[PDB]
Symmetry: D2
Subunit: 295 residues, 4 copies
């Protein structure tokens, strides 16, 4: 099942364009100390498109070393080639990852059957737990709820889905249909500002961007819900809304890296084609961070 609650989609810090593991380790310790229940390394938020294979090995191994088996480490490993995706999955397995996060193939817009065949191929060839990641605004393809349910029903190794389609109809149906196919199938929000409603739909938490900066608050949002305090969960959601929105005024992780820098955790460096946040975004983040008690 991997986890319930908050899994942080952690940034990949750079300094002088190189991996900055000393800043990374400070960030991992902040997550651990604030009750986060998983780390997702090398997702979109960690600039997976621009981190090379040798760097991935170093980052994955170092994350496993710091965490000491306390929470699972889930490694982004999806590409738009089924063959190449398996290769990345087998690399994460060999490094000792606890699962992989595998985005639907981006850019080549596979059919629903193609998506099924992609995950099947991978599932039949690894012992690792696999999390489907649906994010149509980035990939150009949406996993239909029925397709996710078919994957749940058939592929024992696929243990859950990160649902980043923001449509509440999609969220409602993904949760309902997958859990009907397999009661233990996990459904985590892929959007911080949908976590509350995804919990209400009956899902399992969030694979979060906001938790990079506000881990305790995102943890509290889920924890209050799980404890039966719907209205207190909703209040956390409402208090976090400005931060949730600010972190996406430019493409993630541009804002979250500027935020982590303001907070003193990392240098504000990204790799091309990503570039640092505009002054307007930084100014907004500074204000919102201050208002939220994070600065």
């Amino acid at each position: 099942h991997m986890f319930r609650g908050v899994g942080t989609a952690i940034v990949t810090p750079f300094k002088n364009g190189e991996l900055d593991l000393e800043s990374y380790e400070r960030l991992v310790r902040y997550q651990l100390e604030n009750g986060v229940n998983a780390l997702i390394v090398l997702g979109t938020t960690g600039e997976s498109p621009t981190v090379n294979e040798d760097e991935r090995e170093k980052l994955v191994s170092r994350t496993l070393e710091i965490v000491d088996g306390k929470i699972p480490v889930i490694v982004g490993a999806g590409t738009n080639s089924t063959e190449k995706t398996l290769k990345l999955v087998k690399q994460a397995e060999k490094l000792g990852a606890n699962g992989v996060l595998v985005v639907t193939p981006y850019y080549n817009k596979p059919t629903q059957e193609g998506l099924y065949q992609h995950y099947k191929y991978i599932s039949e060839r690894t012992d690792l737990g696999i999390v489907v990641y649906n994010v149509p605004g980035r990939t150009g393809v949406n996993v239909l709820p029925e397709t996710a349910a078919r994957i749940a029903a058939d592929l024992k190794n696929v243990v859950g889905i990160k649902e980043a389609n923001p449509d509440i109809d999609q969220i409602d149906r993904t949760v309902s249909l997958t859990k009907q196919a397999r009661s233990d199938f996990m459904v985590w929000s892929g959007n911080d500002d949908r976590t509350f409603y995804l919990l209400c739909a009956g899902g399992d938490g969030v694979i979060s961007v906001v938790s990079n900066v506000a881990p305790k608050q995102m943890v509290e949002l889920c924890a209050e819900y799980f404890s039966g305090n719907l209205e207190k969960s909703r209040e956390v959601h409402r208090k976090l809304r400005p931060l949730m929105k600010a972190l996406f005024v430019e493409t993630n992780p541009i804002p979250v890296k500027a935020a982590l820098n303001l907070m003193g955790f990392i240098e504000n460096e990204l790799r091309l084609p990503l570039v640092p946040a505009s002054e307007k975004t930084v100014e907004l983040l500074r204000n919102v961070l201050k208002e939220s008690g994070l600065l």
Copy 2:
């Protein structure tokens, strides 16, 4: 300037899991015999995500030797990492490609400045002509006409854009603003069913999927326009409509490969996550190809 008229985004035929260069060459001669003005190899129509490094080199080298300088060979070489893109570009340059088609970074949704910096970084480090490729439905990002025009103004090496945003306002403005910044900047449609309108806007032709099966007719659509025969060009556009629509009932190149197979050119073989066309798709194609005289 590369070319005006039709540039065929050619498929990559496979047979029993490997490149099928014999069928590829038949298809290349079919293009050349029918007046096509350029080949774009290893675009999305050419299943670029699933063609390995060895295969890319062989496919480009073979194309260059078949074509024998009669028309330019432009090689798809864009990824969502600026670093990796440059490598693919330099590889094409080393083989003797006449140009590269470089899609906007997909999945990571770079800002407009990031897009500019991406093309600037590559432009400064190759002597090849570069064609920007905008296809927001696949990539998750839209190159603004104003960004295209800045690119045209500043980057001598970027010679044009394949405009696959289907919005006629975008088509109108890309053509208008790029040519204002640089009169010889080329603008080719990236949608067959926008070619006619893009010509009417002041553009330079099309980088086509349909011309895989109907090269003479796409050539004619452009030729008639260019000769001043607007209504004749419109009539070819209208006659081709069913074929243009049929080739996108499932994600390209699933239908076009089925079509080429029906016509006896290639084996109907794709690589995961793509899968062969449905029976319903094949039925439509069989009927449309007959009506068009192609079967």
Copy 3:
């Protein structure tokens, strides 16, 4: 406050193209007997565009007569002219309606300020409670949450909003911002399939189409939520989903009238430009009604 829970947006039955008050009265008694908390007469679901002024008077008066003051009767009275809207509002007032439902002006796409001025003008000129009705898919204009909050803050007579924008971000913000402006401001869902999530957002119920056929079940959905049984509320929502969806496979109230006819309540008659449900829709409704225990 009008009501919490379920307010039925009741159909206007016709026979031989005339108002059919005998069938209407049977339908009102069904609502009353099943615990509905309000009736909304002459909304979209009651074909307000095609019911003439003399008919409106008869229908409103007859509804008040049958209900005997047991629940409020809220009359649709919004048009796209501010002057004409007031006239309809004053007519409903004079007939003894308990409130009015006033859609944002459709077709002429007023500015946000225009919307404020429209509701202000009306509010300053009636003693009745006014419910704003936001339904951008029909009107071409969306009331921004901030605009609804400004109306809440300023116009004491505007007592709530029927929120039919299906976007969960809109629903979340409409509830949050209006209740922050005025704690007693009511927010009802305008979409049956958003009621659950609108309750979770902290809203007040639903102005329902589905309750025409399944009043007890929609009442149970809200009642369970209000009683603190989130999971039981969600289960009602899930069981009703097929019916919720079926009632909108063609424009409402085309499906709901076909459903009421299958159930024996009304003739399946609409006024032009509306026409009866297709056989496909009827077949679906028959199945879904049967599965739901309504047939």
Copy 4:
């Protein structure tokens, strides 16, 4: 066939709450002096929702006497009730209007068959020429090209369509399919900034907002096209772009009325729920009108 070229959707000037027929006549002469081929009175540009019955009659009667048969006067007469629409149509017919513009029923989202039945019901009961008006952004419904073509095929009295769906595929298909069903069926753009492309598609001109302020230039755009000068027509299109865009920065006719007021034609007076243009809008207009030579 009514006309080819430009038909001005003329504003309805108000002064101190009443019709301003003196300014209206100045504006009518401005149109006639500058070669406009038709007037459309009481369209949405003419604030049809807020003009009362007495005022409609006076405005139509005055227009007919000013124009004195030089060009056709087509009267906006469509509502979302088939019954009421027919009344407005017959009223226009009684006054001596040359035609009626009949928008698809807004707000109630009729099915395609309902749309057909709506126009059939009216067509069978008037001798006037009827122009279908499709503007999905305002009405919530899109007339499918196939429905337009059935209408063209069957209803002798329906003489054309004002196509304000901005999607070039819709424009292409409406023109293609209607003219195939009936060669003399007229197709006019309902968006100024689509006129050029609609002409290129095979259409017959435009029912224009811009021509309120720039009648000669819209006439020229069409005239050049019709004379075979495609690039000259495109150049006028490009030169007019800023004005075309500026007139829709707020909902039409808010900007055009501000523009006409700047030019000294009318008082900048609208009826609720419309309100005068913002300072920012007026600033843009002042600048764009100057650059265009109109101020």
